Write a protein that binds this ligand. Structure first.
Ligand SMILES: [Ca+2]
Length: 80
């Protein structure tokens, strides 16, 4: 899946802030390497703010927030 998709999957409450527990739950539930947590923090929370915003995620990856929002609206609709 795309980074757009994975962001929406991790951010299960839709706040457009990935909390560290959200990230950690995704890693464990998908049997990923726990080092993944540190990599996301380093790439997407470089200033160590304590969470990962949609804004910083998008700036690092060259995405716009509008792309995650579209996907979120489509996922919701599709799911229904
Ligand atoms: Ca969240």
């Amino acid at each position: 899946d795309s980074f757009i998709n994975i962001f929406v999957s991790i951010d299960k409450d839709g706040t457009n802030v990935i909390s560290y527990p959200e990230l950690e739950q995704y890693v464990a539930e998908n049997n990923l390497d726990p080092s993944m947590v540190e990599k996301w923090k380093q790439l997407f929370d470089p200033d160590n703010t304590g969470s990962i915003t949609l804004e910083t995620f998008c700036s690092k990856l060259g995405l716009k927030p509008a792309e995650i929002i579209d996907f979120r609206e489509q996922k919701g609709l599709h799911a229904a």
